[PDB]
Design a protein around this ligand. Structure first.
Ligand SMILES: Cc1cc2nc3c(=O)[nH]c(=O)nc-3n(C[C@H](O)[C@H](O)[C@H](O)COP(=O)(O)O)c2cc1C
Ligand SMILES: Cc1cc2nc3c(=O)[nH]c(=O)nc-3n(C[C@H](O)[C@H](O)[C@H](O)COP(=O)(O)O)c2cc1C
Ligand SMILES: O=c1ccc2ccccc2o1
Ligand SMILES: O=c1ccc2ccccc2o1
Ligand SMILES: O=c1ccc2ccccc2o1
Ligand SMILES: O=c1ccc2ccccc2o1
Lengths: 359, 359
């Protein structure tokens, strides 16, 4: 089966094509991860996936989505990941991390605690920053502060510091979070970026924050470890052909700038959209990006049906299949997939103390 | 559903009737548990089961089954359990432990490393002890040394020390391992106990080691925490009616001696048996013990089909249903069961960072 073929990118080899995408847990305290994360991540790694990407981890305190978000904005924050990385490696999975800045979507409640911007007088909240002083709307009505050029330089450096820390903590795979309406996505989108300086207006200017951040990170991230990004390539906002064309052009620039793989997503930049949800719905758009930018891709949404994951790989729509919620339901989803797809000795997807008894 | 009704025994309340029975991992080193066990057990606890019983944990080095067995024969061994117990409690499951001595079945290879007695000249092995100098046979040919009265006193005290350590490490549930052909079972069975002193011959004498050990443990184990045992009540050796009658009589004595619940098993004392394996096959024998000894029971073997677990509870065959291998396959089996049995808000069997997204 295609799903269980290994994959090599730079010096890193994944044992199969199952990636666990970043999934926020909302369990950190002042950015510091804890035994919630340790057990969650080590357990996932033991389930058999080839790659485990740690949740959106904030490069700066104000770049958390919520008060429960993980952070890597100090060396002490980074140190907290060391034992988890080591446990992921012990289980034979590749440890990755998504480094992030939530931009105008920051300072929000946890999803089971209202999912909305935190009230102004709640002592947990903070001022958000963005390309322009324009609110997302809906459940995220807070108007962000327009970034200064010095803010832009500082956030870029925060991404570099985060990547350097990720490297030194032992991560073997990094993903820059340029998707889902957060800071990077919001610099790219005309909906959110009304700047008239070097960082807004034209395609080149809207691309600039993303490209400069990638280039700056590339200076500290080892060339032998995959350098990746997540990027929303359309919005389902009635401007999809134009948006896709620009996004694919930016993907070509990312590739030329050393990006090894793109995780293809939806932008979620604004709320007034009409996303055609369905199992594997992203496959055709991922395939178009893959083909037109000639860049390896992953995508997600509904690939927990193992036959869908297999079909996407066989059709060359994807290079890796990201499977999120199914792993929250069953940490050992990769074993279920192995059985479904008829992998010989399927139980040996798991470590010996499980595999021996399930065979 | 019956499976998701809470259960109170002494001062302890289980959130549902799902018990995870002891399952050896064979991952300890010189008896010391490690991050294998931490993540395994914490992950299981988060999956939703009401009770998690830690694997057979040796009361003495020679009472390990294998070189990978957990031990609790020193305070330093016990300390290693403290963070795991605390993680189990944090997840809302009740932490239990099975304390054990493998008797003539000790000094064996791990199951995926031959499953047989360790060769005499292998530096990992050790002399086994038992009631009588008689081998199990088959893959366990080693003849054990016949215990002296001082050996008997010492092993009893090792069980007391183990129980005291379990208590002080924060366990809320203890299970004495008097099943599966190990030391305790082998004192009860005429197949393995040919002693002609106070510890063999008559029913009273064959019962004596088990009853004295229970009584000694009872002196240090808090009266407000469940005191339980696992015991093989028949062998499927052509002597089942006689063996069951004696085993039920011993169960009555255990109850009179403060036993709160019996985990009903098969003896596995000798290899030449004909066990009628099948899904839930133990239900009727568990029910007979429950009824005739008027004692709460659990049992196992094939209850990973949630409807079977439900039916056994509704028929009053069992008070708790133990589900073993299905939890190795899927740590979140209790969530699967909740869905199968139509529990409202089934995903909230799991903690918020999972439940919110699966609802
Ligand atoms: C609990 C949860 C948290 C998520 N957190 C992130 C995250 O940190 N970064 C990100 O880019 N996407 C995040 N996502 C999106 C997932 O990575 C994924 O794309 C999505 O869940 C769809 O895949 P699935 O159908 O397999 O779950 C999250 C999704 C879930 C359910
Ligand atoms: C990996 C493994 C290890 C076990 N170790 C123990 C143990 O430590 N003590 C014990 O009394 N039974 C042990 N057992 C038996 C289980 O507790 C249980 O009775 C059995 O697996 C049947 O239940 P199941 O069909 O749900 O797996 C073990 C079983 C397995 C599969
Ligand atoms: O980038 C993100 C971060 C969190 C999150 C939670 C649910 C769904 C999607 C998400 O995307
Ligand atoms: O897959 C594995 C195999 C062995 C192991 C040992 C310790 C911790 C984690 C492990 O994961
Ligand atoms: O008491 C025990 C201990 C280990 C074990 C392993 C497999 C099956 C049954 C077992 O019982
Ligand atoms: O079920 C839970 C809920 C919360 C929690 C926090 C830290 C560690 C484990 C936990 O388990």
């Amino acid at each position: 089966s295609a799903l269980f073929e290994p994959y090599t990118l730079k010096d890193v080899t994944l044992r199969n094509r199952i990636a666990i995408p970043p999934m926020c847990q909302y369990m950190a305290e002042d950015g510091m991860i804890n035994d919630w994360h340790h057990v969650h991540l080590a357990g996932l790694a033991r389930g058999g996936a080839g790659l485990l990407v740690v949740e959106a981890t904030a490069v700066a305190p104000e770049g958390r989505i919520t008060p429960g978000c993980a952070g890597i904005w100090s060396d002490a924050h980074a140190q907290a990941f060391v034992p988890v990385v080591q446990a992921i490696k012990a289980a034979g999975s590749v440890p990755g991390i998504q480094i992030a800045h939530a931009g105008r979507k920051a300072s929000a409640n946890r999803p089971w605690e209202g999912d909305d911007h935190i009230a102004a007088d709640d002592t947990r909240g903070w001022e958000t920053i963005a390309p322009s002083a324009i609110a997302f709307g809906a459940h995220l009505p807070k108007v962000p502060r327009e970034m200064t050029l010095d803010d832009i330089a500082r956030v870029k450096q925060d991404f570099v510091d985060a990547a350097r820390r990720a490297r030194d903590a032992g991560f073997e795979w990094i993903e820059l979070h340029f998707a889902h309406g957060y800071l990077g996505q919001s610099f790219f989108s005309e909906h959110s970026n009304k700047r008239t300086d070097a960082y807004g207006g034209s395609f080149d200017n809207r691309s600039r924050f993303l490209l400069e951040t990638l280039a700056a990170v590339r200076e500290v991230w080892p060339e032998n470890l995959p350098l990746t990004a997540r990027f929303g390539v359309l919005e389902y906002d009635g401007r999809d052909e134009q948006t896709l064309e620009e996004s694919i052009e930016l993907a070509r620039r990312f590739k030329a700038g050393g990006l090894d793989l793109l995780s293809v997503s939806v932008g979620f930049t604004i709320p007034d959209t009409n996303i055609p949800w369905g199992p594997a719905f992203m496959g055709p758009i991922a395939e178009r990006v893959r083909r037109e930018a000639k860049l390896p891709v992953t995508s997600a949404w509904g690939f927990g049906t193992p036959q869908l994951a297999e079909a996407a790989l066989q059709a060359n729509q994807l290079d890796l299949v990201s499977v999120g919620r199914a792993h929250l339901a069953d940490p050992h989803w990769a074993y279920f997939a192995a059985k479904e797809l008829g992998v010989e000795k399927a139980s040996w997807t798991l470590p010996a103390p499980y595999a021996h008894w399930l065979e």
